[PDB]
């Protein structure tokens, strides 16, 4: 039951740093690479007394990669799994998709070939990338395309990072987002959106961190990944695997965009007084104030639901909580999905990391849902891509490196058709 | 059996400070949060050895709120329940009801939602506020409107602080009081007024304190509320819960306006010297000199009456005392209620707070009746409302904040209809 | 025969209970006291070497997780490793797995195992299958093996203790599709089916047992106790004997009407145990109670075609018969008119260890068709909009299979309705 993860971009591999720190501390693996048998899903027993992770850090700017090579985990990661280029894609999906991707795609691909060949019970692949940038969006799409044509049916879970509605870090995220989603629509099996402003709001409100940095965001993302992988790694009352989310959350092939929410995100002072119960932690996962994507599901209708329970959770309590949720009319489901829940229970509570701000808890819930507010998100991004495409601004870079206007137009119309799909299905 | 108390305004949360100090003292709960089953209706047991009150403090200015946050009861209250705004209504119903209240009302109500979700046997809400201010009047009324809409059937008691007839601390308070009473009619289930001059006179006469302050008034109000909820909290020979105030004291849907009295209010030396039997503590609770609303019941007719007893009280003595009250012709009941008393007996004597002035008493009485002098109070307030409304004084503030003259006129005619109702019912 | 996660867990608990009942330790050695335990060991166990008994069971699923959880716990050392039919790709609550996309390479090794296991015994009394009903491999491997088994061995009895799609909240979004298809196969191939659901078990732990956190351990213990009560008479003597075929012929008036709503008694809280008595009426009143059955089918909403009651312990047959007659007479409107004496009683003198008396109830009533319409309506809502169909249709078949099963499930509702 081995799962291998690929991190594309400066955003992907910092999330990888946080995730692999959490994995090393959770399985008791020292930073030099050895313990003082569940580790097989993340680490491979190489020789005797040495564990190497099943992941590849691939990027174009090598400064962060060699920082990883220089820091604490020199011995854990092996230098052949950390792919790094010489020059950046420079916030250009076009550059990283046609100019620089074509020379770096093959090396990462034939490394992942042997990484998967080492696996025996391969569950699937899962990706980390931000579509705002150039390397994560540009050659990430190409790598997804070639993974799909090389493997086809194996799961490719997408934990992407979309630009925030108001908070932005550059000017050309609309183009990159549209051009990446155009291919992610038909190649990614299940995609989970992650917004930076929403996690900022969670940190300000829940963890009361006045001056948060990307490390806290990455730690929260790692908590979510570990929560959705623990049932695979640890035995529980009702455990699920990776192939669940495909069948239980994707009614149509072109609708795979899942809103994520985690509960409880709570600080040490705030956790000191709340009697954590399955009912209230289930309740807190449904409100928009605890979602990882800046969108309001009240404007839409729920299409499916997946609930993950960790710690001291019995099926009685989740049954009661889900039943009470269904009885209330605050949330509503689409009329053709009478049974839209997918529950899973795990025994081991989430491990707390030294230096993390999340308080240790006895129980927690991780949510993967499907609604039609994603149609609001895509229309909101479509507005500000359309404004720029009105006067052909910044497209000279893309055209000059090797794209053409037809790809822009077809991606634009693909998102328009996706909008029509979203509003048609919710009827 | 659980009750959640909400406090609105500066006066509301000072009364809340006194009330929760007394509540922690009576149930043996240290201010840090833990003891060194009666506590259920006020505190919630979390984890192991930690109790959290079922209360919310809300206000628009942060001064008193973070004074509470800084004081001794820091670890008892927890940061979620102390709602604090940025700017106050500044003695303006319109500001706190239309401009500022619309942004703070949702946070209070969806905190109340989860507070009730924690509960299972919610008896009903009870509010603490003053109608003379801006925050307590406007957004307090808005919160009562939304609470009546969302829950409806559950009880909503009101302990308001109406302006004194001659003693005042503001100028535009007739406007605030009238506009708050206009919305308090169809939403408040039982309204118990508390006047400031009356309690000042009580302190000057009973406790012979020359120079009282607001803290003594809050202590007396907290003692009244404790003697009112002791029946829910503690076991008695004849107990009476919150739901009985509506049925036994409200004969008509729009007549819910109650007087309050307490006996005995005594010092240590006088407690040592004079005996405190049931007869005189019942007699002292019926004289107008021991009332918390500056009105004389001899000008009106008693329609209903409720009696609470604590400590060494046997039913035969309360029966004899209520009989002697009934036969004495100094007070007259309406023809329409031949049995107009509701007695309640509890075993627990009232507790004393060190540093206070009230001594340890074997038995105490808290009386809540309904009379016709409410018409006198409302007419006296309406007269000076109309005098100052004649010259269009201060109206520009209210119109600018988002009001107009239509609601002014309808509030005027609504208090006129209240006057007509109170006159016809007394005949 | 056990399939999937639910099948594996209930089978682990069932084998735990049975191994304790016959007095064999988790290492597989006999340490009992009475001589009645040995004489009917062969119905469940095989003597290997040096007085070691191994269960006649076939553990079988698609993922190593459930097998590892079963093997790690106590009484996990008794299962023979050769019976561990074992895949490597996974189920993921997916149809595809279980009849044409991921199960055929395991249906054959399990066929070899069950053939070698059935030919070892002299007179095989029947097959028993415990499996899930909302999963991918729990349904899949399980009732596909039921299909192939019926072709090879038609006369032998087939019993299925299925757990029907959870009733008020659904563990699986695609639960209607998996349940409807499994029921079409079950009506044609399975001889007799016991209907279970987690809702009734949760309610039982709520009210009767008054437990605070009833994990799957208690639910599987309930199901295992029910199983042992069903199969009790084969192992011990009694005043009136009845094996599986007895119940099948006295409970099934028509070949398609073999879905049973089941309960177990006594079930008392440890606080209320000091206050109850131990008599035949105390078993009958608790057995006929609607809040005790293990299915979401209210008997008051329908009519009882036939019923069965298997009693355990030293008891007077006259009292059992008069209690059955009294309960039949007083509730005269809930029993079908053209069929007298709808109840069958059987007495075994050996109760479960630590008890004096017990009873297990099997009731074939037309009130269970309520669940069939409830599931059919959910399938039609999904099928009309063709939701989740791509995961199933592209995996290697046609929509006609979906239509035929819906029509047969609909006919099954109608036949039960005719005798209402």
């Amino acid at each position: 039951r081995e799962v291998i993860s690929i991190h594309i971009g400066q955003a992907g591999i910092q999330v990888g740093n946080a995730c692999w720190e959490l994995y090393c501390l959770e399985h008791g693996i020292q930073p030099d690479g050895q313990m003082p048998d569940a580790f097989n899903t993340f680490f491979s027993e190489t020789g005797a007394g040495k564990h190497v992770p099943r992941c590849i850090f691939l990027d174009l700017e090598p400064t962060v990669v060699d920082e990883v090579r220089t820091g604490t985990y020199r011995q854990l990661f092996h230098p052949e799994q950390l792919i790094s280029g010489k020059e950046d894609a420079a916030n250009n999906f076009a550059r990283g998709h046609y100019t620089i991707g074509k020379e770096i795609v093959d090396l990462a691909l034939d490394r992942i070939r042997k990484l998967a060949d080492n696996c025996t019970g391969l569950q699937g692949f899962l990706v980390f990338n931000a579509v705002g940038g150039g390397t994560g969006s540009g050659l990430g799409s190409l790598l997804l395309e070639r993974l799909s044509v090389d493997y086809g049916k194996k799961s490719k879970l997408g934990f992407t990072v979309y630009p925030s509605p108001q908070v932005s870090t550059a000017v050309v995220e609309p183009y990159n987002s549209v051009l990446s989603t155009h291919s992610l629509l038909e190649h990614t099996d299940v995609a989970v959106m992650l917004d930076n402003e929403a996690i900022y709001d969670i940190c300000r409100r829940s963890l009361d961190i006045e001056r948060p940095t990307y490390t806290n965001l990455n730690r929260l993302i790692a908590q979510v990944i570990s929560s959705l992988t623990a049932s695979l790694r640890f035995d529980g009352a009702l455990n699920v695997d990776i192939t669940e989310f495909q069948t239980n959350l994707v009614p149509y092939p072109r609708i795979h965009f899942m809103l994520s929410s985690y509960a409880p995100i709570i600080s040490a002072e705030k956790a000191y007084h709340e009697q954590l119960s399955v009912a209230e932690i289930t309740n807190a996962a449904f409100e928009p104030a605890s979602m990882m994507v800046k969108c309001d599901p009240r404007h839409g209708k729920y299409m499916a639901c997946c609930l993950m329970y960790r710690g001291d959770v019995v099926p009685k309590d989740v049954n009661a909580s889900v039943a009470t949720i269904k009885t209330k009319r605050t949330i509503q489901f689409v009329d053709w999905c009478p049974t839209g829940f997918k529950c899973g229970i795990n025994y081991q509570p989430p491990t707390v990391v030294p230096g993390g701000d999340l308080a240790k808890v006895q129980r927690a819930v991780c949510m993967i849902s499907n609604s039609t507010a994603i149609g609001e998100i895509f229309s909101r991004l479509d507005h500000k891509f359309d404004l720029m495409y009105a006067k052909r601004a910044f497209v000279h870079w893309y055209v000059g490196e090797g794209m053409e206007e037809g790809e822009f137009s077809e991606a634009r119309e693909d998102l328009a058709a996706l909008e029509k799909d979203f509003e048609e299905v919710g009827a | 059996r659980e009750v959640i108390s909400i406090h609105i305004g500066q006066a509301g949360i000072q009364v809340g400070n006194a009330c929760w100090e007394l509540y922690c003292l009576e149930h043996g709960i240290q201010p840090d949060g833990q003891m060194p089953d009666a506590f259920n209706t006020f505190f919630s047991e979390t984890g192991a050895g930690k109790h959290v009150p079922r209360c919310i403090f809300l206000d628009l200015e942060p001064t008193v709120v973070d004074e509470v946050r800084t004081g001794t009861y820091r670890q008892l209250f927890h940061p979620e329940q102390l709602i604090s705004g940025k700017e106050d209504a500044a003695n303006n119903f319109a500001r706190g009801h239309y401009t500022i209240g619309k942004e703070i009302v949702d946070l209070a109500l969806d905190r109340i939602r989860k507070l009730a979700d924690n509960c299972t046997g919610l008896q009903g809400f009870l509010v603490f506020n003053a109608v003379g201010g801006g925050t307590g009047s406007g957004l307090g009324s808005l919160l009562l409107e939304r609470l009546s809409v969302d829950y409806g059937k559950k009880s909503k008691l009101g302990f308001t602080v109406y302006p004194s007839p001659q003693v005042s601390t503001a100028v535009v308070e007739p406007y605030n009081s009238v506009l708050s009473t206009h919305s308090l009619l169809e939403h408040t289930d039982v309204a118990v007024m508390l006047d400031n001059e009356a309690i000042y006179d009580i302190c000057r006469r009973s406790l012979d304190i020359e120079r009282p302050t607001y803290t003594n008034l809050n202590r007396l109000i907290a003692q009244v509320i404790s003697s009112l909820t002791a029946s829910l909290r503690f076991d008695g020979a004849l107990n009476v819960d919150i739901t009985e105030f509506q049925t036994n004291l409200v004969p008509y849907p729009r007549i819910h306006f109650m007087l309050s009295s307490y006996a005995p209010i005594i010092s240590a030396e006088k407690a040592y010297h004079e005996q405190l039997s049931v007869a005189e503590i019942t007699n002292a609770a019926f004289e107008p000199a021991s009332m918390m609303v500056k009105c004389d019941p001899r000008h009106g007719k008693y329609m209903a009456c409720c009696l609470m007893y604590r400590g060494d009280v046997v039913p035969k003595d309360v029966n004899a005392s209520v009989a002697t009250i009934k036969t004495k012709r100094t007070i007259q009941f309406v023809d329409w209620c031949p049995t107009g008393f509701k007695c309640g007996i509890n075993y627990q004597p009232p507790t004393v707070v060190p540093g206070g002035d009230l001594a340890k008493v074997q038995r105490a009485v808290c009386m809540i009746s309904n009379s016709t002098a409410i018409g006198e109070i409302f007419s006296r307030l309406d007269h000076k409302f109309d005098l100052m409304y004649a010259k269009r004084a201060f109206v520009h503030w209210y119109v600018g904040e988002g009001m107009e003259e239509g609601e002014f006129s309808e509030a005027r005619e609504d208090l006129a209809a209240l006057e007509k109702d109170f006159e016809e019912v007394g005949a | 025969i056990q399939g999937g996660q639910c099948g594996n867990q209930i089978g682990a608990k069932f084998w735990e209970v049975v191994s304790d009942e016959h007095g064999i330790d988790p290492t597989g050695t006999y340490h009992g006291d009475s001589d009645l335990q040995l004489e009917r060991i062969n119905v469940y166990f095989n003597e290997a070497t040096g007085g070691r008994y191994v269960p006649r069971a076939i553990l079988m699923d698609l993922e190593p997780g459930t097998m590892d959880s079963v093997r790690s716990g106590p009484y996990g050392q008794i299962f023979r490793p050769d019976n561990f039919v074992f895949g490597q790709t996974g189920a993921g609550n997916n149809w595809a797995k279980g009849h044409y996309t991921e199960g055929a390479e395991l249906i054959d090794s399990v066929l070899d195992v069950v053939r070698k296991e059935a030919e070892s015994c002299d007179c095989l009394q029947g097959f028993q299958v415990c499996h899930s009903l909302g999963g991918g491999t729990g349904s899949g491997m399980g009732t596909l093996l039921i299909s192939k088994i019926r072709e090879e061995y038609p006369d032998r009895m087939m019993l299925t203790f299925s757990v029907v799609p959870s009733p008020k909240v659904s563990d699986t979004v695609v639960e209607p599709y998996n349940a409807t298809l499994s029921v079409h196969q079950l009506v044609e191939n399975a001889d007799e089916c016991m209907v279970l659901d987690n809702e009734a078990l949760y309610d039982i732990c709520f009210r009767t047992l008054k437990l605070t956190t009833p994990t799957f351990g208690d639910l599987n213990h309930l199901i295992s106790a029910v199983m042992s009560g069903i199969t009790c008479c084969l192992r011990f003597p009694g005043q009136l004997n009845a094996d599986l075929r007895k119940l099948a012929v006295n409970l099934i008036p028509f070949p398609r009407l073999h879905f049973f709503m089941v309960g177990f008694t006594p079930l008392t809280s440890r606080g209320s145990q000091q206050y109850r008595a131990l008599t035949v009426p105390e078993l009958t009143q608790q057995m006929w109670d609607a809040k005790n059955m293990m299915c979401a089918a209210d008997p008051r909403h329908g009519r009882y075609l036939t019923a069965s009651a298997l009693f355990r312990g030293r008891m007077s047959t006259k009292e059992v018969d008069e209690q059955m007659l009294n309960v039949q007479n007083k509730n005269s409107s809930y029993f079908v008119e053209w069929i007298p004496n709808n109840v069958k009683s059987s007495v075994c003198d050996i109760p479960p260890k630590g008890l004096k008396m017990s009873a297990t109830f099997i009731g074939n009533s037309t009130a269970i068709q309520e669940m069939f319409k409830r599931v059919s309506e959910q399938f039609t809502a999904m099928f009309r909009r063709k939701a989740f169909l791509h995961w199933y249709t592209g995996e290697g078949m046609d929509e006609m299979e979906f239509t035929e099963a819906e029509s047969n499930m609909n006919d099954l509702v109608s036949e039960y309705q005719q005798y209402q």
Partner: peptide
């Protein structure tokens, strides 16, 4: 008036290329 202004709910304009239909089968 900034506080009391009513909210507006309109799609914030796109190209004239609104003609594309959903790629899903209609029902």
């Amino acid at each position: 008036s900034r506080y009391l202004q009513p909210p507006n709910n309109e799609e914030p304009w796109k190209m004239s290329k609104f003609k594309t239909g959903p790629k899903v089968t209609q029902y």
